[PDB]
């Protein structure tokens, strides 16, 4: 590209001089290509597009070697210097401005079936790799190269697939889910309407797995934001061009006062996002949610909407008793051969809905008991009754022995919402005892 | 208009060159049309207007293909480049300033009887489609095309009307209300002084209906604001150019402290709005309010205005039990034929006041009982008594089993304000018992 523009610039400069020689020394000497002329040359011999007609849209250039469109002005301005090095920043801006008016408007290819990779675009419908073309409008791509892998790479006798088995404590469902998680992470146009949480007390490898995703996927392609930080001002601004969002560390049992922004991103509904000192606008994020926490956080919603969105990974394995291998976190996951195999296996994996492991379901039920004290009381009933409201209330087994405040007769309406027998009214059965109380089961 | 402007610019440049030849080589050579001449040519051969005479008003250009006036400076500057490509940003701004000085001032057509649609304007008085003309000043239009529909479109054997029936659990009143809600949503100049709230326990399809509305209407034409976010600073600024506002998710039972701006927007009264780092100004919003919540929120007003402004949609249907059809939310509602049929049926529907379903009336009454403890106690009275204030008080049936703080006698004044028998004072009937108390009904 640089060699092409350098030849074009010299040819155009020579042509201008020849015309000036033909007209004689009228004034000074034309040695600098005019900014409008530069736009004419660049548009002809390069691919400049405009993403949309909205005001102050930045010009996008298709850099041939990378195969993706870029809006970086410095990259574009460097290209201007190849054609006309004598242009300063103001004149280069004039060249950019002229190109903005000239170029046609094309929208970014947001097809979920296409995933850009360093080697080229990957079409999930055909499960085939396609070479970079200007027709595919992409602004970012996965850093790792896509090559066909037949044998699992081994570095110092360490197997990446066995490491995944070690992380999941040799659980077939979890390792299947973990591969599905990596598959969903790379695709930035399909969200699958699920949120992934990593729960580990300590040294469970959550950070290494996050660093693995940060390595197989581009470093710039990932976002760092916690669950409680989604609703803060300007925090959603970072998720503009991110394929996925990773929560490096979530506070233990943090109270998510408002999960509306979190729930919208997980489902994929449009959310209100504002850049700092910039006007508020509306956009849709399809990136998946990855969060690492040392314990399931508490959500104020206590509704079915939050429950369906959440997915939990057990991470039962501990690396404290076993000797810590800093080589895994620092070197092994950064190996190119290891990364390429992970990319090849994950992107080739095809699935429609997240295959929920039984361990996640059991641990998800634990969170439901923790989140809703009423549901925990229903689970912990273990009783063979409906007519006496005070008996079935029983102060909810003394706060269900959890020290969580419970309303009076309001959660009772919420209780029957949770649950065949429903409500039966009998005057005989329905204040024998105030009930603190050790009568776990009556007659 | 690109061809016309190119020809005009070439002709003007040729005329200037001929004039310079007539005057000889006085100095250099005139090849760039002066900005004032460009403004003259554009005003002669295009339609530029100014919405109002207030300071720093942006010039509006009638783009012929779209049929609506636009204030986007990039489009106008692209038009300038079509006329004279060699102007940079500064000279384009000079042309825009000259045009602003030249053009006349016309106000936007805010007639509620006219609804701009992609094909053309729709007159509700005549219920007829009219082609685009510069006479109608519109800044935005409905994205979907208006075509006459005779048969309900079917994609993969899925019927949109049957989907609406399924959403409303085969309730004629609720589906009629939904069609009326869509009809109100399309019109951005008539507010009808009602607020629509979607309540759903689980997967009730509220998000799918919101996406359907955002698809039939223009994506840029909808605002994303929740109720509790109405009074947050700079949040109303987005509402200026939106036909309707939709809250994607509302926290379950969120305590909306201040509802003044929300009530004003629902009624349509003028409200004070401020953009970030921009002067405060008073503006009138006629957009309709649609909100999705997993439970009816609470308002501190306990006033008739909040009750009369609010309208609730049951959404009793649940898609958690029936297998979820992701194609409904992802693909089927994005079908052009389905969107066109929905547009036609909704815009052709004619009604004056929101036909409130009986289910909404019962659910609205349940919200009224929840909002005011005194009203709920009065409903739960079921008693055959007026003279003893403490007896009829009964601590409001001991908080009415809803742990709501109640005034000792101010709420009594509020009760007698709400409610034939009124008050009768008798010394005989009026401290037998302190009254906690199980005497539900006395003699
Ligand atoms: N298979 C393995 N065997 C032994 N040590 C390992 C293995 N995989 C990773 N490690 C080490 O275990 C540590 C994992 O750190 P990390 O994942 O951050 O712990 P964590 O507390 O669970 N995550 P975080 O809460 O963000 O700190 C690193 O020192 C790794 O080098
Ligand atoms: N008729 C239908 N039959 C089955 N599934 C449906 C039907 N209509 C929609 N769905 C699916 O049901 C889901 C609707 O999601 P959504 O409307 O967001 O649930 P919601 O909780 O009520 N709204 P929200 O609170 O914002 O999440 C999507 O997965 C749709 O594909």
UniProtKB/TrEMBL annotation, chains A, B:
It comes from Staphylococcus aureus. The keyword Transferase does not apply. Keywords: ATP-binding, Helicase, Hydrolase, Nucleotide-binding. This is DNA primase. Residues 173-328 form the SF3 helicase domain. The keyword Glycosyltransferase does not apply. One of its GO terms (molecular function) is hydrolase activity. The chain holds residues 316 to 766 of 790 of the full protein.
